[PDB]
Amino acid sequence: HQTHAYHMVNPSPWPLTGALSALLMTSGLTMWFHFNSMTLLMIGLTTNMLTMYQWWRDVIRESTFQGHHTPAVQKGLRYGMILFIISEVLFFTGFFWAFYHSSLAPTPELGGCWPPTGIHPLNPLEVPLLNTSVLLASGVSITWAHHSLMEGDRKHMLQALFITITLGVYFTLLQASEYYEAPFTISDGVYGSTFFVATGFHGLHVIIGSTFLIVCFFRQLKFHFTSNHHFGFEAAAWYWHFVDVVWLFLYVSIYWWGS
Amino acid sequence: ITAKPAKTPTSPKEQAIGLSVTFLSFLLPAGWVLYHLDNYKKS
Amino acid sequence: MFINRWLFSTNHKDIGTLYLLFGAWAGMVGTALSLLIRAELGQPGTLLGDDQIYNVVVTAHAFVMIFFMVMPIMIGGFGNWLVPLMIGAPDMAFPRMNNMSFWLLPPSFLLLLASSMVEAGAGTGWTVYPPLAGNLAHAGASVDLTIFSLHLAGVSSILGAINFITTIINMKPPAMSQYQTPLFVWSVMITAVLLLLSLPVLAAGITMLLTDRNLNTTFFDPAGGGDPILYQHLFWFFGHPEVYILILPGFGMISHIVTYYSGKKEPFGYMGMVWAMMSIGFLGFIVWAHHMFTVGMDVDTRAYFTSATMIIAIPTGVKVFSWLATLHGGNIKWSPAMMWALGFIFLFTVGGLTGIVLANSSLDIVLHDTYYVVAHFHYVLSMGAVFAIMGGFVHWFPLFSGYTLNDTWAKIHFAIMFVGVNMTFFPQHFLGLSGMPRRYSDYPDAYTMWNTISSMGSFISLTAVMLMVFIIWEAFASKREVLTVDLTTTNLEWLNGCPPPYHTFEEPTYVNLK
Amino acid sequence: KIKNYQTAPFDSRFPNQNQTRNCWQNYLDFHRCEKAMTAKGGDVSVCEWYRRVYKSLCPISWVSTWDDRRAEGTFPGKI
Amino acid sequence: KIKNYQTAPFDSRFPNQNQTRNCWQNYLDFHRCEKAMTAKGGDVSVCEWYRRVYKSLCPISWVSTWDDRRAEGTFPGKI
Amino acid sequence: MAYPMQLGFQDATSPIMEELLHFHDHTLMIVFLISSLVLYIISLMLTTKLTHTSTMDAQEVETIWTILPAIILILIALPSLRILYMMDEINNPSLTVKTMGHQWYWSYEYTDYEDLSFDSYMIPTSELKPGELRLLEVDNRVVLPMEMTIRMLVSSEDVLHSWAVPSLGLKTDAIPGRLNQTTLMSSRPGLYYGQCSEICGSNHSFMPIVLELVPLKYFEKWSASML
Amino acid sequence: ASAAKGDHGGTGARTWRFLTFGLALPSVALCTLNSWLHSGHRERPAFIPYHHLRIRTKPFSWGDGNHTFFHNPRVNPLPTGYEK
Amino acid sequence: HYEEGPGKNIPFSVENKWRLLAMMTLFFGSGFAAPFFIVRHQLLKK
Amino acid sequence: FENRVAEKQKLFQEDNGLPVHLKGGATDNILYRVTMTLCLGGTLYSLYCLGWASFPHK
Ligand SMILES: CCCCCCCCCCCCCCCCCC(=O)OCC(COC(=O)CCCCCCCCCCCCCCCCC)OC(=O)CCCCCCCCCCCCCCCCC
Ligand code: HEA
Ligand code: HEA
Ligand SMILES: CCCCC/C=C\C/C=C\C/C=C\C/C=C\CCCC(=O)O[C@H](COC(=O)CCCCCCCCCCCCCCCCC)COP(=O)(O)OCCN
Ligand SMILES: CCCCCC/C=C\CCCCCCCCCC(=O)O[C@H](COC(=O)CCCCCCCCCCCCCCC)COP(=O)(O)OC[C@@H](O)CO
Ligand SMILES: CCCCCC/C=C\CCCCCCCCCC(=O)O[C@H](COC(=O)CCCCCCCCCCCCCCC)COP(=O)(O)OC[C@@H](O)CO
Ligand SMILES: CCCCCCCCCCO[C@@H]1O[C@H](CO)[C@@H](O[C@H]2O[C@H](CO)[C@@H](O)[C@H](O)[C@H]2O)[C@H](O)[C@H]1O
Ligand SMILES: C[C@H](CCC(=O)O)[C@H]1CC[C@H]2[C@@H]3[C@H](O)C[C@@H]4C[C@H](O)CC[C@]4(C)[C@H]3C[C@H](O)[C@]12C
Ligand SMILES: C[C@H](CCC(=O)O)[C@H]1CC[C@H]2[C@@H]3[C@H](O)C[C@@H]4C[C@H](O)CC[C@]4(C)[C@H]3C[C@H](O)[C@]12C
Ligand code: CUA
Ligand SMILES: [O-][O-]
Ligand SMILES: [Cu+2]
Ligand SMILES: [Mg+2]
Ligand code: NA
Ligand code: NA
């Protein structure tokens, strides 16, 4: 049939269900903001999760179970994941740009100073520093997981990945607590705006990245990864380091320099 | 480029039909709306 | 089988066909909007209503022409059809994700439709500047639907960019380096890099507008310490790259068309053409504030942006002269596609040159927010991007369909369109120099003659659009099946016949190294 | 009284098209001076220059809003 | 306003062991105030608080050197 | 103001506007020349039966078509930036006037000595006096002294606007929370017209600017008349 | 920098586990201790109805429209001040 | 597998040129008409 | 756990002509129909909401 190494994918419904899920989530957000109803949004969130679940289930079937991930296919996926992370970096760049724009030139409405009059920042040496050690530590433990996997060590791969996930969850719970304890809010001018939208999109990426690591954990429990072939784990590790690095920029920029 | 003769040749009469139908399909609906503009700006 | 094939596609050719159909339909919508604009302006006074309904039309006209006509046709349509064939690849790297880039566009378009049907529409300009676009001057759902429309179009193109870059880097024959791939492939790869980097910034910016409108943030609201000008920076950091995204695949198609109908095996100065596209793509990221020369920036910043913008003329001029040098010595075939491409070279040059006029911040004070700008960008968009699209459509229609067009009809269509676009837009230079502002539903009486002539031009272009539909019908109606084409040794996309089989390159090409 | 004031002169601290801070600075300078000259036993005539400059440069609504907020206790600049 | 000055009070702007900037700032403030006054005609008496604070905090040799440099035209702070 | 069938800029009313006219003439010469050269070369390439289809070497010719455009760009940028820096120069004005954009009209403040302010609305077409200009007149013009350097400060109290007077070479965006400065100097008395130049909603097309330039003694009489 | 540690020869699983338990998790432990020392609630500040804070240009799409999503009555005043 | 060849690689039929003309007329016509009817809708709305 | 990947390999390589999203068996069809029904129904509902929101109401 073919004598190249690339993957001809079975016709699939998940592109269409994913696109429709986008329509339902966006029109659903519109209904929520303007017509006091969450109905469409809940449908859209549900169909989005169902779509991602079935699509990535199929990628596992195609690779672990059917053998379609030749080295050429794997190399493509490596490029794809790097490019996706680059687009995510540029997304965050827009929020850093907004933060520096506002904070380097504080307008008269703020008091002409930064932090604005009336804003009392979190102490960066308290929970923000703890969060920083948590994500840095999880970058060490995920690297231990990676090396254990490459060396064929199932037990220590699972232990290290579990530690990594635990730390991601710890970060998320620390941040949820800090959001609740924060004496300023998203409606507290451009300080609250930049703080909560930038750390909030970051927190979303922590949750995404943790979920990805959890998927890897269960696939590892099911023996899907070989010591040489485990791109889902590599992609989740790349994504995790990206989440760690964004945090370090947030910490230095918003929590520390911006305090 | 080279090509086989038309399997289903479209005569000049046939072309005049397809052209007229095509032009009408753009012009008549827009025409109807624009003709009735004043009829809209009062309702 | 119909649903499996057309809704569940994982085939680069069928997905390309969907994009071409989508973009054609969008082009009708965008044409209708342009005629409503020109009907309003075609005599003094008010036809439709005040500036609100008028600028809902203007805003929609732009979004439709850019996001639903040009980018889907050039990148989703020609890109999906041609790029795998030109590198001998069996499909795209992510054939299933590719189908989602397509199916996100009908929802995106539906959201734009919804924006114009609810409340009073989004009468903001396609730039969507606050505070006009904020929740006090545009209360209600219209601007939020417009933001969500852009979000879905953005995700479509970001994923498409990831797919094209991966395909083009990873799926060439192992002997083929990047410097053996055709210029259209280069143009798509560079366009895709620009999309990857610029759309997330736009996404950040319009998400901040969304939260200013709905979550009580104040990124752009001075009352909270925000700044409307920050929005403009974020928008244009995307918006200048975006216009190079709109033209670069066009440059790539023009290179192929001019080479082909000059009877040449290759474009003049291949590495210079690659250099020029990479240079334009890079410079396109460092010039955005030439959209902001009247907002109050410091004089040294205006000088930097004047200078950096003008230097893009240098690589662009290399491409223009290389196209001329590709014609040089050719056995010229005066095909309709060649006519489109020749019109492109000249009229794109005129529009690029009025862009260089506008790059001078001092003169831009008088020209900014006038019809001179409108004249500049319709020469590069209505007579550049569109001419490249028409040239590529008539050139490759027999490949995609298996049927030939009537060449005499296609030449008539070119002639009508050429008159119509020049009658529409050339007088708009006079309107701009003499001070007619952008985004006006009506104008002081002195501006009547050229507005009248410009609106007459827009009707001639409408006659061309209608004729194009008939021409495509005539081709499918008569069923002249292609036998052979010339120059297949240097145009690989033709070598599997017309149309190529659903699966091509199941056995890859043989290319050795030596 | 070194006057014959016509309008605010060029201020090298604020040489660019954006004059927002120039209006703000002279408004703060006037009100800081006027407060100093009340709580310590002097004359506000010493503050007159800042008064003329901010009145020349500042939109009336900006002055009016800042005045209202000083009276409310919500003015965010330090006086 | 009334006196009873004993020494310079705690100043939240300078809460740490290094008090160099507290001396410096109050010296600048006094001489800035004094220049402002002796001009518009008013009274250096309104500057008195800064004078008491910087005299309390500043080493005599620092004041003397800064005074000498102001007379020389070599004082590097802005007054 | 513009006049019927106008092809170019409104006549320059200020020295900076005359500089722009001469700079535009210089740049348009170059645009016409390059445009016409490209058109000519296209026709030259297309009008011979002589052929040369083998590989052509490109290096030598690409020096010429990078160096020659580079020189041309420099010949545009040099006078362009000269005028840019001229517009920015310290000019020491004798008068400051503020204008505030609104939906949909302009207000003006003359607060150098007296606290004068007023609104400026378009005259509806139905109220125009005979011979007055459709969409361009206002009820209260910006009275100003001719032959004097004036500082205009521009802002907005709602959405963006932009304050423009083409024959003076002026266009300054009106942005809420921001005070933008430009300088105005009319060589002549008279009436000078402009229009809002940033999309601002329903009546963007209908909030014009009219300056009324008069001798200083007459400007003083006018201000004095507002007490 | 070389930091002050010292290992390699081979970076492998054993070394990264050594870093995980010997450096990374001890650091988390110390920061956790540090953080649980400086925990405990600050005196909440006088309310001042600053116009650049407590922004309300449209009601929130939840509750009564006037409470932020993670509103904390102890430390987040409404536009009209703290709640009872 | 799917059908291949001219007129078979498209989601619409070209088996009958007059059926086709109707299809194409509905397709392009509906897109060209939609803005006129949206404008009518907004003018009629209020 | 024990490594049962070979048994999944056998299942998903069975020559039954099923596309991968349905090859796991009847559960796949249920989940697919749930998903598509929600998408298509929600889309129909979103169109209804457009029609409602396009005219003055409340
Ligand atoms: C295909 C046809 C479709 C129909 C639509 C039209 C198409 C356009 C073709 C028309 C072909 C016209 C060739 C040159 C037109 C210049 C007209 C002019 O007098 O320009 C005046 C200036 C401003 O000038 C002034 O400040 C004062 C002007 C009056 C001087 C005193 C004389 C008083 C009487 C005036 C008599 C009129 C003079 C005209 C003199 C005329 C000399 C040529 O305006 C401008 O800058 C406007 C131009 C802005 C940038 C475009 C330049 C690139 C064009 C080069 C190739 C043509 C591409 C066309 C694109 C298409 C060309 C193939
Ligand atoms: C395909 C789309 C496209 C393209 C390719 C371009 C290309 C260029 N554009 Fe344009 N532009 C737009 C679409 C495009 N633009 C749009 C849509 C807007 C409006 C946005 C809005 O406000 O809505 C706009 C606005 C715009 C402005 C802002 C004006 C304002 O709002 O006041 C400026 C200013 O510098 C500008 C400049 C240029 C320049 C210098 C180029 C250059 O890349 C052109 C380079 C080409 C040449 C110079 C011709 C070929 C060269 C030679 C033959 C060599 C010899 C030439 C010389 C020596 C000069 N453009
Ligand atoms: C690609 C972009 C594009 C294109 C092609 C056009 C084409 C046209 N434009 Fe548009 N226009 C914009 C982008 C475009 N425009 C933008 C970005 C703005 C600014 C918006 C703003 O201010 O916010 C604008 C603004 C604008 C204005 C100014 C409004 C104002 O300031 O008040 C006017 C006025 O005449 C105008 C008119 C026209 C006309 C008459 C055409 C005609 O030339 C159209 C004629 C028809 C075609 C060119 C065919 C299109 C269809 C196809 C190519 C599909 C063919 C099918 C197949 C190949 C299968 N446009
Ligand atoms: C466990 C929490 C810890 C980590 C944070 C995790 C979750 C963040 C989730 C999503 C973040 C995405 C959007 C950012 C929007 C704002 C949320 C900011 C983070 C957040 O949660 O902010 C909260 C406000 O949330 C609010 O308004 C309401 C937020 C809910 C509605 C969001 C609706 C808008 C979504 C728009 C997304 C567009 C995305 C487009 C991407 C396209 C890419 C091309 C802060 O609460 P507060 O009470 O004001 O102050 C605390 C006082 N005690
Ligand atoms: C509270 C609960 C909330 C839940 C919300 C969830 C939201 C997102 C969930 C997180 C992402 C989960 C991704 C799981 C991917 C599993 C499939 C997978 O990992 O597939 C791997 C391929 O990787 C690949 O496609 C790589 C696939 C890359 C996926 C990357 C996903 C990134 C996140 C996207 C969303 C970003 C949103 C940004 C918002 C601004 C399969 O190849 P291997 O691993 O080599 O196996 C083969 C070997 O067995 C052979 O021996
Ligand atoms: C306001 C709210 C707006 C909401 C908009 C929401 C719009 C989207 C709904 C999204 C539904 C997503 C469903 C899951 C998609 C998974 C795609 C994926 O994982 O694609 C993979 C490729 O992308 C790769 O790897 C690269 C890595 C994977 C990329 C996955 C990204 C998901 C999209 C999120 C949005 C990103 C925007 C980023 C910048 C801001 C695999 O490609 P396939 O062609 O499938 O198979 C190839 C076979 O060989 C595999 O065996
Ligand atoms: C900008 C793009 C638009 C370009 C212009 C379109 C070109 C004109 C197309 C013709 O359109 C028709 O014109 C008729 C008028 O000639 C209208 O009949 C109307 O007028 C008749 C006589 O006055 C009556 O018989 C009809 O009932 C009444 O509907 C009819 O509705 C309309 O479809
Ligand atoms: C426009 C952007 C500010 C965006 C913001 O306000 O958010 C600023 C940030 C950094 C600035 C640049 C840097 O200050 C470096 C250069 C300084 C020169 O005086 C002008 C060009 C110069 C290249 C600047 C152009 C422009 O003002 C930049 C790019
Ligand atoms: C070196 C590189 C590739 C050569 C090759 O490997 O084939 C070539 C391709 C295009 C060339 C450039 C273009 O021809 C444009 C410029 C032409 C000038 O004559 C030299 C600099 C100039 C910027 C060139 C430098 C260099 O020779 C480039 C960059
Ligand atoms: Cu005000 Cu346009
Ligand atoms: O954008 O040119
Ligand atoms: Cu640009
Ligand atoms: Mg503008
Ligand atoms: Na690995
Ligand atoms: Na009109």
- How far apart are the CA of C385 and the centre of ligand 3, in A? 11
d(CA F26, CA F41): 23
As beta bridge partners, residue F143 has: F212
**Structure tokens of A106?**
């504080």
Q: In this structure, which topology does domain C2-514 adopt according to CATH?
A: Cytochrome C Oxidase; Chain A (1.20.210)
CB atoms within 10 A of CB C333: 12
Domain boundaries, chain B: 1-43
**Structure tokens of E16?**
């740490």
d(CA A73, CA A65): 15
Residues of G in contact with A137 (CB under 8 A): 20, 24-25, 27-28
Q: Which atom of ligand 1 is nearest to the CA of C372?
A: 49
Ligand 2 in reach of C338 Cβ (< 6 A): no
**Which of C426, C453, C455 to mutate to test ligand 1, by most ligand atoms within 8 A of the CB atom?**
C426
Residue F163 neighbours by CB under 8 Å, 6+ apart: F99, F101, F106, F152, F154, F170, F171, F172, F173, F174, F194, F196, F197, F209
d(CA F26, CA C369): 22
Say whether both F104 and F191 belong to one domain: yes
Q: Are A99 and C206 in contact (CB under 8 A)?
A: no
Ligand 7 in reach of C28 Cβ (< 6 A): no
Quick one: how many helices (H) and strands (E) in chain H? 1, 0
**Which of B25, B27, B33, B40 to mutate to test ligand 7, by most ligand atoms within 8 A of the CB atom?**
B27
Q: Are C444 and F135 in contact (CB under 8 A)?
A: yes
C24 touches chain H (CB under 8 A): yes
d(CA D30, CA D38): 12
H30 closest CA partner among C390, C26, C69: C26
Say whether both F51 and F156 belong to one domain: no
d(CA A102, CA C227): 8
CA distances from C513 to A71, A241, C175, C177 (A): 21, 39, 6, 10
Residue of the CA atom closest to atom 47 of ligand 3: C31
Antiparallel, parallel or unpaired: β F190-194 and F209-214: antiparallel
CA distances from C147 to C201, C243, C446 (A): 14, 19, 38
Coil, helix or strand at residue A245 = helix
Judge residue E10's burial from the number of C-beta atoms within 10 Å of its C-beta, 0-12 exposed, 13-18 middle, 19 or more buried: exposed
- What are the backbone dihedrals phi and psi of residue F163, each rounded to the nearest 5 degrees, phi first? -100, 115
Q: Which atom of ligand 7 is nearest to the CA of B24?
A: 9
Handedness of CA H7, H8, H11, H15 (dihedral sign): positive
Q: Are C147 and C209 in contact (CB under 8 A)?
A: yes
Domain boundaries, chain H: 1-46
Angstrom resolution of this structure? 1.8
Residue of the CA atom closest to atom 62 of ligand 1: C422
Q: Are C79 and C15 in contact (CB under 8 A)?
A: no
CA distances from F174 to A109, C235, D74, F85, G39 (A): 18, 19, 27, 22, 48
**Structure tokens of B14?**
């046939």
CA dihedral F149, F155, F161, F167 (to 10 degrees): 0
- How far apart are the CA of C301 and the centre of ligand 8, in A? 6
Q: Are F144 and F219 in contact (CB under 8 A)?
A: yes
* Angle at the Cα of A123 from the Cα atoms of A118 and A124, rounded to 5 degrees: 125
Instruction: Please provide the distance, in angstroms rounded to a whole number, between the alpha carbons at the two ends of chain H.
Output: 54
Closest residue on chain C to I54 (Cα): C118
Q: Which atom of ligand 10 is nearest to the CA of F207?
A: 1
Judge residue C177's burial from the number of C-beta atoms within 10 Å of its C-beta, 0-12 exposed, 13-18 middle, 19 or more buried: exposed
User: In this structure, which amino acid lies at residue D49?
Assistant: W
d(CA H39, CA C53): 8
Q: Can you say which residues of C are annotated as belonging to the binding site? A: 40, 45, 61, 240, 244, 290-291, 368-369, 376, 378, 441
d(CA A195, CA A176): 14
Query: What count of Cα atoms within 13 Å lies in the side-chain half-sphere of residue G7?
Result: 13
Q: Does an H or E element contain C37, and which?
A: helix C12-41
CA dihedral G48, G52, G55, G56 (to 10 degrees): 100
* Yes or no, beta carbons of D7 and F177 under 8 Å apart: no
As beta bridge partners, residue F209 has: F194
User: In this structure, which amino acid lies at residue E51?
Assistant: R
- How far apart are the CA of D17 and the centre of ligand 12, in A? 22
Q: Which atom of ligand 7 is nearest to the CA of C36?
A: 1
Residue of the CA atom closest to atom 1 of ligand 4: A176
CA distances from H10 to C405, E12, H3 (A): 17, 77, 10
* Angle at the Cα of D7 from the Cα atoms of D5 and D13, rounded to 5 degrees: 110
Judge residue A104's burial from the number of C-beta atoms within 10 Å of its C-beta, 0-12 exposed, 13-18 middle, 19 or more buried: exposed
Q: Are F155 and F101 in contact (CB under 8 A)?
A: yes
* Yes or no, beta carbons of F204 and C51 under 8 Å apart: yes
DSSP string, A66-79: T----HHHHHHHHH
**Structure tokens of I46?**
């979103």
Instruction: Please provide the distance, in angstroms rounded to a whole number, between the alpha carbons at the two ends of chain G.
Output: 55
- To which residue do tokens 């004729």 refer? C467
Q: Are C326 and C259 in contact (CB under 8 A)?
A: yes
d(CA C192, CA C200): 13
The residues in F 146-175 lying below 8 A from C, measured between CB atoms, are 158-160, 162, 164, 166, 169-173, 175
Q: How many domains does chain I have?
A: 1
Ligand 10 in reach of F16 Cβ (< 6 A): no
Residue of the CA atom closest to atom 2 of ligand 10: F204
| Min Cα–Cα distance to chain A from G30, Å | 9
d(CA F177, CA A190): 14
Q: Which atom of ligand 3 is nearest to the CA of C23?
A: 54
Q: Are F171 and F117 in contact (CB under 8 A)?
A: no
Using what technique was this structure determined?
X-ray
d(CA F48, CA D37): 90
Coil, helix or strand at residue C457 = helix
d(CA F7, CA E78): 56
Ligand 10 in reach of F101 Cβ (< 6 A): yes
d(CA H14, CA C479): 9
Alpha helix (H) residue ranges in C93-219: 95-103, 105-117, 142-170, 183-214
SS (HEC) of F6-38 = CCCCCCCCCHHHHHHHHHHHHHHHHHHHHHHHH
| Min Cα–Cα distance to chain B from H35, Å | 9
Alpha helix (H) residue ranges in chain A: 14-34, 39-60, 71-104, 127-150, 154-181, 189-221, 231-250
Question: Could you tell me how far CA A160 lies from the centroid of its own chain?
Answer: 19
User: In this structure, which amino acid lies at residue C471?
Assistant: I
Residue of the CA atom closest to atom 1 of ligand 11: C240
F96 touches chain D (CB under 8 A): yes
Query: What count of Cα atoms within 13 Å lies in the side-chain half-sphere of residue C52?
Result: 16
**Structure tokens of C356?**
């260089």
Residue A76 neighbours by CB under 8 Å, 6+ apart: A6, C93, C94, C166, C167, C170, C171
Ligand 10 in reach of F196 Cβ (< 6 A): yes
Q: Does an H or E element contain F174, and which?
A: strand F170-174
DSSP string, C63-91: HIIIIIIIHIIIIIIIIHHHHHHHTT-SS
As beta bridge partners, residue F99 has: F108, F154
**Structure tokens of A239?**
């994504």
d(CA C36, CA C47): 10
Judge residue F166's burial from the number of C-beta atoms within 10 Å of its C-beta, 0-12 exposed, 13-18 middle, 19 or more buried: buried
Q: Does an H or E element contain C13, and which?
A: helix C12-41
Q: Can you say which residues of F are annotated as belonging to the binding site? A: 161, 196, 198, 200, 204, 207
* Angle at the Cα of C124 from the Cα atoms of C436 and A38, rounded to 5 degrees: 175
Say whether both F190 and F219 belong to one domain: yes
Ligand 10 in reach of F200 Cβ (< 6 A): yes
As beta bridge partners, residue F163 has: F172
Helix, strand, coil shares, percent, chain G, to 5: 30, 0, 70
Say whether both F134 and F178 belong to one domain: yes
- What are the backbone dihedrals phi and psi of residue C46, each rounded to the nearest 5 degrees, phi first? -115, 130
**D20, D21, D77 member nearest A111 (Cβ):** D77
Chains E and D touch (3+ CB pairs under 8 A): yes
Antiparallel, parallel or unpaired: β F95-102 and F150-156: parallel
Residue C475 neighbours by CB under 8 Å, 6+ apart: C397, C401, C403, C404, C405, C406
- Ligand nearest the Cα atom of residue C232: 8
d(CA C259, CA C251): 12
Q: Are A118 and G48 in contact (CB under 8 A)?
A: yes
* Yes or no, beta carbons of G52 and C135 under 8 Å apart: no
Q: Are A92 and I51 in contact (CB under 8 A)?
A: no
As beta bridge partners, residue F162 has: F173
Region at C439 (left for phi over 0; alpha for psi -120 to 50; beta for the rest): left
Say whether both F114 and F205 belong to one domain: yes
CA Rg value for chain E: 13
C13 closest CA partner among C502, C404, C496, C492: C502
Q: Does an H or E element contain F154, and which?
A: strand F150-156
Ligand 7 in reach of C39 Cβ (< 6 A): yes
Question: Could you tell me how far CA A148 lies from the centroid of its own chain?
Answer: 24
Ligand 5 in reach of A55 Cβ (< 6 A): no
**Structure tokens of C267?**
């474009």
Quick one: how many helices (H) and strands (E) in chain D? 3, 0
**Structure tokens of C505?**
């390159």
Q: Are C211 and A193 in contact (CB under 8 A)?
A: yes
Residues of A in contact with D26 (CB under 8 A): none
Q: Which atom of ligand 10 is nearest to the CA of F198?
A: 2
Antiparallel, parallel or unpaired: β F105-110 and F95-102: antiparallel
Residues of F in contact with D7 (CB under 8 A): 93-96, 112, 151
- Ligand nearest the Cα atom of residue B31: 7
d(CA A209, CA E75): 59
Closest residue on chain D to C298 (Cα): D16
Question: Could you tell me how far CA C31 lies from the centroid of its own chain?
Answer: 14
Q: How many residues does chain C have?
A: 514
CB atoms within 10 A of CB F147: 12
* Yes or no, beta carbons of D18 and C296 under 8 Å apart: yes
DSSP string, G10-42: S--HHHHHHHIIIIIHHHHHHHHHHHHHS-SPP
d(CA A194, CA A96): 8
Q: Are G72 and A181 in contact (CB under 8 A)?
A: yes
In F10-121 the beta strands, taken as DSSP E runs, fall at 95-102, 105-110, 116-120
Say whether both F53 and F7 belong to one domain: yes
User: In this structure, which amino acid lies at residue C339?
Assistant: M
CA distances from D71 to C223, D76, F110, G47 (A): 18, 12, 26, 16
Q: Are C298 and C306 in contact (CB under 8 A)?
A: no
**Structure tokens of G72?**
């904390």
Q: Are H27 and C28 in contact (CB under 8 A)?
A: no
Handedness of CA A166, A167, A171, A177 (dihedral sign): positive
The residues in C 390-409 lying below 8 A from H, measured between CB atoms, are 400-403
C306 closest CA partner among C294, C290, C291, C319: C290
Judge residue E24's burial from the number of C-beta atoms within 10 Å of its C-beta, 0-12 exposed, 13-18 middle, 19 or more buried: middle
Judge residue C392's burial from the number of C-beta atoms within 10 Å of its C-beta, 0-12 exposed, 13-18 middle, 19 or more buried: buried
d(CA C80, CA C98): 9
Which of D13, D20, D63, D72 to mutate: most A Cβ within 10 Å?
Answer: D20
Region at C128 (left for phi over 0; alpha for psi -120 to 50; beta for the rest): left
Coil, helix or strand at residue C125 = coil
d(CA C21, CA B43): 37
Coil, helix or strand at residue F212 = strand
**Count of CB pairs separated by less than 8 Å, A with G:** 115
Q: Are C355 and C340 in contact (CB under 8 A)?
A: no
Closest residue on chain I to C120 (Cα): I54
**Structure tokens of F57?**
């070497």
SS (HEC) of D17-55 = CECHHHHHHHHHHHHHHHHHHHHCCCCHHHHHHHHHHHH
- To which residue do tokens 């009629």 refer? H44
A193 closest CA partner among G62, C134, C216, G66: C216
Judge residue A5's burial from the number of C-beta atoms within 10 Å of its C-beta, 0-12 exposed, 13-18 middle, 19 or more buried: middle
- Ligand nearest the Cα atom of residue A226: 5
Residues of C in contact with G51 (CB under 8 A): 223
Question: Could you tell me how far CA F80 lies from the centroid of its own chain?
Answer: 15
Q: Are C76 and I12 in contact (CB under 8 A)?
A: no
**Structure tokens of A210?**
């943790």
Helix, strand, coil shares, percent, chain B, to 5: 65, 0, 35
Coil, helix or strand at residue F57 = coil
Q: Are I38 and A47 in contact (CB under 8 A)?
A: yes
Active site residues per annotation of C: 61, 91, 126, 156-157, 240, 242, 244, 255, 290-291, 316, 319, 438
Q: Are C201 and C233 in contact (CB under 8 A)?
A: no
Q: Does an H or E element contain F170, and which?
A: strand F170-174
Q: Domain limits at I51?
A: 1-58
